[PDB]
Design an enzyme around this catalytic site. Structure first.
Site, PDB file in Angstrom:
ATOM      1  N   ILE A  14       0.803  -1.229   0.000  1.00 47.88           N
ATOM      2  CA  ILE A  14       0.000   0.000   0.000  1.00 47.88           C
ATOM      3  C   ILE A  14       0.831   1.272   0.000  1.00 47.88           C
ATOM      4  O   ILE A  14       0.536   2.220  -0.724  1.00 47.88           O
ATOM      5  CB  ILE A  14      -0.867   0.123   1.263  1.00 47.88           C
ATOM      6  CG1 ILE A  14      -1.964  -0.933   1.283  1.00 47.88           C
ATOM      7  CG2 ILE A  14      -1.446   1.521   1.340  1.00 47.88           C
ATOM      8  CD1 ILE A  14      -2.856  -0.836   2.509  1.00 47.88           C
ATOM      9  N   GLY A  15       1.846   1.296   0.859  1.00 46.84           N
ATOM     10  CA  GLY A  15       2.719   2.452   0.981  1.00 46.84           C
ATOM     11  C   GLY A  15       3.834   2.177   1.979  1.00 46.84           C
ATOM     12  O   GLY A  15       4.074   1.021   2.324  1.00 46.84           O
ATOM     13  N   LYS A  37       0.719  -2.642   8.918  1.00 48.94           N
ATOM     14  CA  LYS A  37       1.803  -1.667   9.015  1.00 48.94           C
ATOM     15  C   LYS A  37       2.991  -2.258   9.772  1.00 48.94           C
ATOM     16  O   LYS A  37       2.961  -2.373  10.999  1.00 48.94           O
ATOM     17  CB  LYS A  37       1.330  -0.391   9.713  1.00 48.94           C
ATOM     18  CG  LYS A  37       2.456   0.577  10.019  1.00 48.94           C
ATOM     19  CD  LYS A  37       2.069   2.012   9.704  1.00 48.94           C
ATOM     20  CE  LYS A  37       0.805   2.445  10.434  1.00 48.94           C
ATOM     21  NZ  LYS A  37       0.444   3.885  10.177  1.00 48.94           N
ATOM     22  N   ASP A 131      -2.494  16.286  12.441  1.00 45.58           N
ATOM     23  CA  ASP A 131      -1.938  16.010  11.123  1.00 45.58           C
ATOM     24  C   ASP A 131      -3.037  15.709  10.112  1.00 45.58           C
ATOM     25  O   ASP A 131      -2.893  14.843   9.249  1.00 45.58           O
ATOM     26  CB  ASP A 131      -0.939  14.850  11.207  1.00 45.58           C
ATOM     27  CG  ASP A 131      -0.012  14.784  10.005  1.00 45.58           C
ATOM     28  OD1 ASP A 131       0.199  15.828   9.349  1.00 45.58           O
ATOM     29  OD2 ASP A 131       0.528  13.693   9.720  1.00 45.58           O
TER      30      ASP A 131
HETATM   31  C1  LIG Z   1      -1.549   4.760   7.336  1.00 48.48           C
HETATM   32  C2  LIG Z   1      -2.562   3.827   8.013  1.00 48.48           C
HETATM   33  O1  LIG Z   1      -2.525   3.701   9.243  1.00 48.48           O
HETATM   34  N1  LIG Z   1      -3.487   3.164   7.243  1.00 48.48           N
HETATM   35  C3  LIG Z   1      -3.551   3.312   5.760  1.00 48.48           C
HETATM   36  C4  LIG Z   1      -4.688   2.421   5.505  1.00 48.48           C
HETATM   37  C5  LIG Z   1      -5.216   1.845   6.551  1.00 48.48           C
HETATM   38  C6  LIG Z   1      -4.522   2.235   7.800  1.00 48.48           C
HETATM   39  N2  LIG Z   1      -6.282   1.034   6.168  1.00 48.48           N
HETATM   40  N3  LIG Z   1      -6.431   1.080   4.991  1.00 48.48           N
HETATM   41  C7  LIG Z   1      -5.504   1.918   4.375  1.00 48.48           C
HETATM   42  N4  LIG Z   1      -5.443   2.172   2.928  1.00 48.48           N
HETATM   43  C8  LIG Z   1      -4.551   2.978   2.299  1.00 48.48           C
HETATM   44  O2  LIG Z   1      -3.674   3.591   2.901  1.00 48.48           O
HETATM   45  C9  LIG Z   1      -4.620   3.125   0.899  1.00 48.48           C
HETATM   46  C10 LIG Z   1      -4.536   4.437   0.306  1.00 48.48           C
HETATM   47  C11 LIG Z   1      -4.600   4.594  -1.104  1.00 48.48           C
HETATM   48  C12 LIG Z   1      -4.749   3.448  -1.949  1.00 48.48           C
HETATM   49  C13 LIG Z   1      -4.833   2.149  -1.379  1.00 48.48           C
HETATM   50  C14 LIG Z   1      -4.770   1.983   0.030  1.00 48.48           C
END
Ligand SMILES: CC(=O)[N+]1=CC2=C(C1)N=N/C2=N/C(=O)c1ccccc1
Lengths: 301, 258
Positions: A14-15, A37, A131
């Site tokens: 995801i990132g 995460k 934030d």
């Molecule tokens: C940073 C964090 O704590 N979380 C991020 C996410 C969480 C919990 N749960 N789902 C998340 N989805 C994404 O971040 C995402 C953004 C764009 C495209 C695809 C996926």
């Protein structure tokens, strides 16, 4: 602990970043899709990061429909996993995709309404997000939006002091913080929301500063340069210079054209200069603007 | 007075009844005693002074410790390890810049390893299930200080002092709610310094009357009176500083006239 990680199947990164990595994973036994995460703990051997300490203890004390849900926490010997409910996309990517067509006002109102509810829940539980920006806001295919990423969140049972390395990204930073105030308050969050509100309505960021001073100026240039009458005490703030170019207050109908009367009324209350006079999330939810709110579904890509 | 002032108070009143430790857990501790605890908390006060940590951190660490000992048998020799980890955890949670592990290992005089302290940190997080955002006497005093018509620095310092003294003695303070101890400390400080009593506004806000606070107040007054002859002296030493207006030197009234 290791038995739990075994039940997870990675799906796509995801990132990531400094914190760690954020994969999309699937529970092998239940089929449940989660956002995993991963945090490497040897990158300091100082124990668990403070952002983890805060996001966890504060998140697992905030159960609300408009706040991402922390499902589990797996602490191994070298790694720490935060298991979140998975949401399909963040508001930043969504805004990009809606650049051509724009985000429907009803959906914009639905999203602001929800964000104000999760935020009001936070503040009433003495938590400052600190934030609130587009990429930290998650949306799902059902038309729901949730506050996420609480790494910089603070509990304020005791006043939270202003810190230089732990602040909202510039474009969403409140003027009190820029003018060097001593403490944060719930108002800093409402200001971020106000900027995101306008950004959704116009398809462009409200105050895209290049520096702290350029940021301040873009704000003065639109809302007008604040004076003691408008904001009792401004002139006496740490970074307030009397040499500030005195600008006049632009006409909101020209700043956020698409907005009706109520829409403009709310935005201006969310962007009020005096943090003591700035509308609260609680009060905002009562604004006539949400008189006819609905819950449309987004057109996710 | 943010508009969430009442919401937060109400919420802290709810939480304080859950992050609540077993009132008689020390009896069930096979190897440690209230006196040993008192020495531990006193030492943490000193550590707080040394590293210039917030009072809130001290209160959170004592909360973490009582909750941990409420469900874990610990031996004399490991008690300080639990205390150190608790302090480290409260720092990460409350401080802007928490002291590094090495510093915590330092102040224990190499009685433990950096490895041990971190392992104990992990165990404490497991036992408290990461629930660190606990209500403290400190947080309630902050709330109460707003309903102080003529804001008095000495009154606030003295209340802090009294609230901190309660952290040292499990018996009898473990049986009172933080909001109640804070109430007693506020009234007592107020009375000692200005002759005024538990304010009408706080009665409406907390629902506590001078009558309801009496039990805790009776205990606190005694603790105040005997404070100079207590085996632990770190708090009095701390509160005779300029920053605290040397309030630990003030004479407690002979009678509360309640
Ligand atoms: C940073 C964090 O704590 N979380 C991020 C996410 C969480 C919990 N749960 N789902 C998340 N989805 C994404 O971040 C995402 C953004 C764009 C495209 C695809 C996926």
């Amino acid at each position: 602990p290791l038995v739990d990680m075994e039940n997870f199947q990675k799906v796509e990164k995801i990132g990531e970043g400094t914190y760690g990595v954020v994969y999309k994973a699937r529970n092998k036994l239940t089929g449940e899709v989660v956002a995993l995460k991963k945090i490497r703990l040897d990158t300091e051997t100082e124990g668990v990061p403070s952002t983890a300490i805060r996001e966890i203890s504060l998140l697992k004390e905030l159960n609300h429909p408009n706040i991402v849900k922390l499902l589990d926490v797996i602490h191994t010997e070298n790694k720490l996993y935060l298991v979140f409910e998975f949401l399909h996309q963040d508001l930043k990517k969504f805004m990009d995709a809606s650049a051509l067509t724009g985000i429907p006002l009803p959906l914009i109102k639905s999203y602001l309404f929800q964000l104000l509810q999760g935020l009001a829940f936070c503040h009433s539980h003495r938590v400052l997000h600190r934030d609130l920006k587009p990429q930290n806001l998650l949306i799902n295919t059902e038309g729901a939006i949730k506050l996420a990423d609480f790494g910089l969140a603070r509990a304020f049972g005791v006043p939270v002091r202003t810190y230089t390395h732990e602040v909202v990204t510039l474009w969403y930073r409140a003027p009190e913080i820029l003018l060097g105030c001593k403490y944060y308050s719930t108002a800093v969050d409402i200001w971020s929301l106000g900027c995101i509100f306008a950004e959704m309505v116009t398809r462009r960021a409200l105050f895209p500063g290049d520096s702290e001073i350029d940021q301040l100026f873009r704000i003065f240039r639109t809302l007008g340069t604040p004076d003691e009458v408008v904001w009792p005490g401004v002139t006496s703030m740490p970074d307030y210079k009397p040499s500030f170019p005195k600008w006049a207050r632009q006409d909101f109908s020209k700043v956020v054209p698409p907005l009706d009367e109520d829409g403009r009324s709310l935005l201006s209350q969310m962007l009020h200069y005096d943090p003591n006079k700035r509308i609260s999330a609680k009060a905002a939810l009562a604004h006539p603007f949400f008189q006819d709110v609905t819950k449309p579904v987004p057109h996710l890509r | 007075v943010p508009d969430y002032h009442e919401d937060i108070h109400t919420y802290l009143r709810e939480m304080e009844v859950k992050c609540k430790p077993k009132v008689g857990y020390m009896k069930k501790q096979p190897d440690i005693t209230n006196s040993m605890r008192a020495i531990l908390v006193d030492w943490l006060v000193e550590v707080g002074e040394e590293y210039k940590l917030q009072n809130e951190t001290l209160h959170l660490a004592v909360n973490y410790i009582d909750r941990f000992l409420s469900s874990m048998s610990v031996l004399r020799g490991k008690l300080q390890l639990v205390g150190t980890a608790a302090m480290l955890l409260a720092s990460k949670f409350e401080e802007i810049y928490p002291p590094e592990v090495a510093e915590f290992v330092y102040i224990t005089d190499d009685t433990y390893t950096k490895k041990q302290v971190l392992r104990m940190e992990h165990l404490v997080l497991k036992v408290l299930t990461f629930d660190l955002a606990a209500p403290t006497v400190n947080q309630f005093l902050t709330q109460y200080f707003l309903h102080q018509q003529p804001a008095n620095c000495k009154v606030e310092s003295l209340a802090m002092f009294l609230g901190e003294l309660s952290l040292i003695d499990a018996d009898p303070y473990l049986k009172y709610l933080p909001s109640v101890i804070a109430g007693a400390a506020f009234h007592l400080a107020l009375y000692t310094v200005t002759g005024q009593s538990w304010p009408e506004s706080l009665i409406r806000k907390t629902g506590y009357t001078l009558e309801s606070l009496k039990p805790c107040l009776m205990d606190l007054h005694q603790t105040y009176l005997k404070a100079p002859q207590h085996a632990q002296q770190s708090i009095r030493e701390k509160y005779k500083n300029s920053k605290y207006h040397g309030v630990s030197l003030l004479n407690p009234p002979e009678t509360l006239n309640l």
